[PDB]
Symmetry: C3
Subunit: 247 residues, 3 copies
């Protein structure tokens, strides 16, 4: 159904990797050779565009935008697209986002790869699903091989890449200083309103996952770098993909 349309649309392009673009990274859609832009509304069932082509000399699909849980209160907003990506032969999903840092040592404009997360005030996107596949193990949701490759790519470009735990809050209002003190007490390094439900759905669909946050601000109570933060992340990603033949 959705799979059918995209297959027609893709020239017979066969990407192994898809990238969900967070705020600040929307522009990456432009640096895509032989690009094929598909609006979300053309795609039946999809909840804002899908772009497929060559990036870093390798075939990719990008989602410019995503629907967040806070928008309609639907944590499974991204279920159908993620399923569709899986059915197109994508084996790897890279998720990017904007986040607040809970660490002095990790200022705005820093990039942090996710090694784990905490679902705090989100809802679980697999509620209402049937069959035993729903009991998804999440011990290594963030693929160890991909997390290493990203680290190696950052070192090759000589960009700092932090590592840490992302805590998901529903939003859309930001956190109070007390909620931020709690988040830290609970073990998070950064907070945000996205990504986690897509990681869960990805693991449900058998996709390997990497993720990274651009730090745009310190968390509330601790008191624009979002563009250079994003250019840093893009450079790590590009380098990561060129170095990977079978990635």
């Amino acid at each position: 159904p959705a799979v059918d349309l995209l297959i027609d649309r893709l020239n017979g392009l066969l990407p192994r990797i898809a990238i969900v673009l967070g705020s600040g990274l929307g522009g990456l859609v432009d640096e895509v050779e032989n690009a094929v832009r598909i609006p979300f509304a053309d795609i039946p069932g999809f909840p804002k565009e899908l772009v497929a082509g060559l990036f870093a000399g390798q075939p990719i699909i990008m989602l410019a935008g995503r629907v967040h849980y806070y928008e309609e209160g639907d944590a499974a907003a991204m279920r159908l697209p993620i399923e569709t990506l899986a059915s197109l032969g994508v084996t790897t999903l890279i998720l990017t986002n904007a986040a607040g840092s809970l660490r002095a040592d990790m200022p705005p404009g820093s990039v942090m790869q996710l090694i784990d997360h905490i679902n705090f005030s989100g809802h679980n996107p697999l509620i209402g699903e049937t069959g035993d596949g729903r009991f998804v193990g999440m011990t290594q949701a963030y693929d160890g091989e991909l997390a290493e490759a990203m680290r190696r790519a950052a070192d090759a470009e000589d960009i700092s890449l932090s590592s840490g735990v992302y805590m998901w809050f529903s939003g859309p209002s930001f956190e109070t200083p007390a909620e931020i003190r709690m988040a830290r007490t609970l073990g998070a390094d950064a907070v945000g309103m996205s990504t986690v439900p897509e990681v869960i759905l990805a693991r449900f669909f058998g996709l390997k996952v990497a993720a990274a946050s651009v730090i745009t601000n310190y968390g509330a109570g601790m008191t624009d770098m979002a563009p250079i933060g994003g250019r840093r992340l893009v450079a790590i990603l590009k380098r990561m993909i060129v170095d990977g033949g079978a990635d």
Copy 2:
């Protein structure tokens, strides 16, 4: 629509301040000169009465009662009234409630002003809202100037006023001793089932916020003063308002 009705009803009274009355304080509606009582059912859209008149020689609207999240599972129950208050020219919202104390040093009958909160098992009232106004900063949700005035008024009446962080639980069942141990570990000073969603909505609508809890009990596992607690709070409020010309 709702604004229209209240404007007709209010004699051309123009309050800057509204007070949401928690359990125990319902009676304050009676000590209101030139009072104008409006039942909630007369007001179209409202989810229990609205009372406007002179209090402490100053124009006020009071909500005797509120709809809690636990009643129908609607965290935005109070959205329409709070919006309506804003549209009537109210610039300041004072929220009162009953809460459980997590501090030995803060017994039943104490009054605690809120300097911050933690939304624990509530839902965010702005889920499903559109436009960038929904990304409400909550760094100083509890107005610093109002929190000081309340403190000064308490000292002038020689009433103790505690200060602390309120944690919101959905309810309607109370917390277990283990949940109370957690609440403290997470940094709360008091717990309850109200207020926080109205603070969020208020900040969304540009209103300055003050809040205070009457402590009616210690939190579960730590083991009637609710009336004197309320009379203490009323005395602080009255004093706060008489001392403020432009409040």
Copy 3:
């Protein structure tokens, strides 16, 4: 309505105790003298079978299975059955489940009775209920007299019985290592996706509650005994019931 059917079905059997059977314990339904099996679909309103008869020489109802919050997103799934049990004259509810251990000292195959719980990412089953009965005190949700009897029965059989706090996560995906570190930091000894909403509903309906988890695994990041774990629990339960005349 549901009460009517079960009364007809029960031969005029009058159980004081009901047992909700978790994964692994379904088989206990077989060791029930004079058994009367009733499928859930025969029972009007029920959300998988109800079995009543003699167990350990005493009259009992067992629920083989339960509907979890994660299945349809309905935390009050078990409301109607629990109410129905109360209306049949059941005064005591024993809940069993599978759980993950957060303690080295409590390995897979251990049995842990619940002395308290933490509702973490569950929803409260009493949201949407009317009347003052909904404000259920939960200071001693796990009956002290029943918890002692279970302990005494374990010692008589010479089985180890741990004691601790169960934290409820919605599921259906399992917890990340970071969520497990948090659960411990918040004071839990074991985690799972069940039981807590039924404890709340039970207390709402005036039933005394005992609960126990079979430990099937360590919690994520810390790295089959579920059958012997269950046989241990069954032995404690049997011994507990034979020793109780008025239990």
